[PDB]
Design an enzyme around this catalytic site. Sequence first.
Site, short mmCIF file in Angstrom:
data_model
loop_
_atom_site.label_atom_id
_atom_site.label_comp_id
_atom_site.label_asym_id
_atom_site.label_seq_id
_atom_site.Cartn_x
_atom_site.Cartn_y
_atom_site.Cartn_z
N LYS B 10 44.01 49.07 43.84
CA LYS B 10 44.69 48.29 45.42
C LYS B 10 43.67 47.74 46.92
O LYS B 10 42.77 48.50 47.22
CB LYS B 10 45.49 48.77 45.97
N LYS B 15 38.39 52.80 48.58
CA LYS B 15 37.65 52.53 47.24
C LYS B 15 36.54 53.02 47.48
O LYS B 15 34.70 53.09 46.92
CB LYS B 15 38.25 52.35 45.64
N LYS B 41 35.69 41.20 49.43
CA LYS B 41 35.49 41.54 50.57
C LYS B 41 33.44 42.87 50.74
O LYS B 41 33.14 43.21 49.57
CB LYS B 41 35.83 43.11 51.25
N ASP B 129 43.64 44.48 42.80
CA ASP B 129 45.13 44.12 42.99
C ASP B 129 46.04 42.86 42.14
O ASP B 129 46.70 42.39 41.21
CB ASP B 129 45.06 43.34 44.21
#
Lengths: 289, 289
Positions: B10, B15, B41, B129
């Site tokens: 998620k 992470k 990202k 996600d």
Amino acid sequence: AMRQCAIYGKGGIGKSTTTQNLVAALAEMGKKVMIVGCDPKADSTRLILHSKAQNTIMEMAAEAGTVEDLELEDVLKAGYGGVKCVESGGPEPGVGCAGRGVITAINFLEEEGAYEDDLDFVFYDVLGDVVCGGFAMPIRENKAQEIYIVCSGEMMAMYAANNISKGIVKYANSGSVRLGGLICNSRNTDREDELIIALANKLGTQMIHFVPRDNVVQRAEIRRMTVIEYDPKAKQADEYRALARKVVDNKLLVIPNPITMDELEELLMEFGIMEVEDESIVGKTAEEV
Amino acid sequence: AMRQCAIYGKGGIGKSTTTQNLVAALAEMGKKVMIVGCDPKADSTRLILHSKAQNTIMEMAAEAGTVEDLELEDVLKAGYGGVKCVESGGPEPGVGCAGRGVITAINFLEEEGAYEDDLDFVFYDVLGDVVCGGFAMPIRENKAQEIYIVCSGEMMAMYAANNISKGIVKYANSGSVRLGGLICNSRNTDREDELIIALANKLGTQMIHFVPRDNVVQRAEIRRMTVIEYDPKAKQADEYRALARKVVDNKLLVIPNPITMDELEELLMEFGIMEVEDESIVGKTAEEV
Ligand SMILES: Nc1ncnc2c1ncn2[C@@H]1O[C@H](COP(=O)(O)OP(=O)(O)O)[C@@H](O)[C@H]1O
Ligand SMILES: Nc1ncnc2c1ncn2[C@@H]1O[C@H](COP(=O)(O)OP(=O)(O)O)[C@@H](O)[C@H]1O
Ligand code: SF4
Ligand SMILES: [Mg+2]
Ligand SMILES: [Mg+2]
């Protein structure tokens, strides 16, 4: 008359609690609303219907053969205050495109006349961690004209809000999809309200409401309902009514001005969430500086 | 020799912090490693390189016309402990598929011989996600054999862990991709360690480490580096070294057993995160039950 809206945002920030509670508040205002769940977790209509996760268009099409074998009344169920509830569903975690169920769901509801009922509002509850398949489709096609983003005073929520804004910017010539505002759903972080007002101002929109974090939400949800139906006289119930009143009255629908990662970090630095950095100590160990 | 691994989860469970600190500990114990950032990202290699978001293949191929004119040392940069870093990047937030960069990045890296180095490990840092495009590609095609899911004691984190597990189960006959374990990154919740131990046992895997929430991470990250490099004597650094020891020595690679959403809620009820609910209170107001 009929206004199509959409609640986007990060995973777990609060958009199903916010959408179901604002919609339930519009129901007691006398507005006829439809919620279209556009998140693969199929629990965006639970509180309106007093149920476990509602059966999705994807699951019912699979049991019947195809979407051609479905009836609108088998998919669209009425709940609290008469709001009509449908769930898109979507592909199993390994396969295809996770947002495909949203494209087949809006197309079925259009072909079956769900939008041609006497609806005052339609609210799409859509996943916003990734803005691209059927998830980007309420924006790419001209389906949801008023976008409200639920976020909080943390990086991913604000990053997700900024990316959803870049999707609104990309299709701004293609239609009338605009940003209506930002909903700060409190995580009880210190200058959180102020930080979403500042992000909002950078994007050119507003923080249309600060929803408090209140435990009545949990107490209302084990009974499987909205706070608006559980305790109509709770503090939090009037917080959702106030958000509902401002969305109804809202006319500020803008093409947002998305910021950089630097300006996003600087927002969190100004409001004390992230700590201040300087280039001199960058790359230098704890014992050197 | 070379083991290919992937860290999923998620958005915001930690992470990128967990993967850079873990790989920094591996380089600190002589292992030759490459990190392929598979999250739109683009900050999965920041702390290894002492930099802002690293120039992605997607950015560089876009301002160059094709991926043919890209040089491998423009894309793959070495930083702390000799670990090489490449960033996939992603499409603009309303177009294409958010995972396309992962597919062009891995195919570029294969053609350019990046896996033919004497690397002991490869770590893919991936957005979990949604499990569907380029995001699902490390599992769909047999790219990462050992999957470690970073999660926490709240519903979305555990939900994503279960969905990534379903992704692995879907391609089990196709290759050798299995679930190596679960990494509880602490939110300082009470029985969170036990909860993720019990989710892992249900799945048929292990909680291979409980990573503590420690502020030395934020102090290391404003210096734009890992805790392993900033303060090798701090407690959190020996926690990332413990996790790296257990990953080098992990031999439990299973086909997981995904649980139902009811069983997921019953787990949150049993460890006191979510509260207990019966069907006699469901549907009734504050003034009734
Ligand atoms: N204002 C609030 N007060 C208390 N709990 C809230 C509030 N808003 C949301 N929640 C809780 O936050 C979690 C996520 O809400 P949800 O609406 O399901 O998020 P999302 O639909 O964006 O995935 C659940 O525990 C939900 O009940
Ligand atoms: N063990 C930890 N202790 C404290 N903060 C942490 C820890 N792990 C991650 N963080 C913080 O959590 C946020 C997200 O981490 P990140 O690794 O960037 O998440 P994700 O890669 O899954 O998007 C940042 O504030 C990061 O510094
Ligand atoms: S378009 Fe988005 S939802 Fe669809 S496969 Fe790609 S990343 Fe997944
Ligand atoms: Mg939801
Ligand atoms: Mg990351």
